[PDB]
Design a protein around this ligand. Structure first.
Ligand SMILES: [Ca+2]
Lengths: 58, 223
């Protein structure tokens, strides 16, 4: 329900080590994190550009 | 791999690393032109790295071959994770010879208690993050379907099996996905998912390869 841009990054149950971006509202910037490969939440982007376009300013 | 040991350079010749600008998943070579991995490891521009030990340094026995085809199981369910298997065709045939070899597919499924070898370049810490340079190994037993379902209520399908130790401390972890679970020289599982790493009562979950042998053989032969 709340702004998905403010949710902490979600690695998920799968065990891959895929680098994705998430918007870090505390730092005011899109940062990288490890995504496991499945069950991604919305604050998970394939590029800094996608992250900024979607969550910039949150 | 958490709680494992250094395998030793090229001691697991069928282990490959899937690279997309960095290591993100593992895989198992089953033929000079084909690799088996997990469906959730599907990515564009995959480069398969064979003959690897130190994943961060060129040691002289590596073969970097790009994927020409990455076929995810037609019934893979990205929500339940059922049918988490993928076949990758290599653009050129790999040169097999001691340090690079294929692993046999199973002729029958493995029973609970069967000791297996799980390997990968994934995180080695149950708390925190530390990625190894060299390949890590872990000996772990296949667990009963009953115990697997008890650990993960309503999440275990007929195409999944648990392996590891309920006490915790030994398990596969982020970066190991798609990698091998070999028992008695046969590829019985593919690193798929879990709950945290090496946590008590939360063993790793693996794709049950024995249920896909017919599909694997026919798919490889028709591509
Ligand atoms: Ca290397």
């Amino acid at each position: 329900r709340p702004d998905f841009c403010l949710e902490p990054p979600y690695t998920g149950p799968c065990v891959a080590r895929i680098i994705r971006y998430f918007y870090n509202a505390k730092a005011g910037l899109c940062q990288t994190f490890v995504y496991g490969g499945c069950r991604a939440k919305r604050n998970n982007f394939k590029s800094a550009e996608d992250c900024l376009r979607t969550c910039g300013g949150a | 791999i958490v709680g494992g040991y250094t395998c030793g350079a090229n001691t697991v010749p069928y282990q490959v690393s899937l690279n997309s600008g960095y290591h993100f998943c593992g895989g198992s070579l089953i033929n000079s032109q084909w690799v088996v991995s997990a469906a959730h490891c599907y990515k564009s521009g995959i480069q398969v790295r064979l003959g690897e030990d130190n994943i961060n340094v060129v040691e002289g026995n590596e073969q970097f071959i790009s994927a020409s085809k990455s076929i995810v199981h037609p019934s893979y369910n990205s929500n339940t994770l059922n049918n988490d298997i993928m076949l990758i065709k290599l653009k050129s045939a790999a040169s097999l010879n001691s340090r690079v070899a294929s692993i046999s597919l199973p002729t029958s499924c493995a029973s609970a208690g069967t000791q297996c070898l799980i390997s990968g370049w994934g995180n080695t810490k149950s708390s925190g993050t530390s990625y190894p340079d060299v390949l890590k190994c872990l000996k772990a037993p296949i667990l009963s379907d009953s115990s697997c379902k008890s650990a993960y209520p309503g999440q275990i399908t007929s195409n999944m099996f648990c392996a590891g130790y309920l006490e915790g401390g030994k398990d596969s972890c982020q970066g190991d996905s798609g990698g091998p679970v070999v028992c008695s020289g046969k590829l019985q599982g593919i690193v798929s998912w879990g709950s945290g790493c090496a946590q008590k009562n939360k063993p790793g979950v693996y794709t049950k390869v024995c249920n896909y042998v017919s599909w694997i053989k026919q798919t490889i032969a028709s591509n």
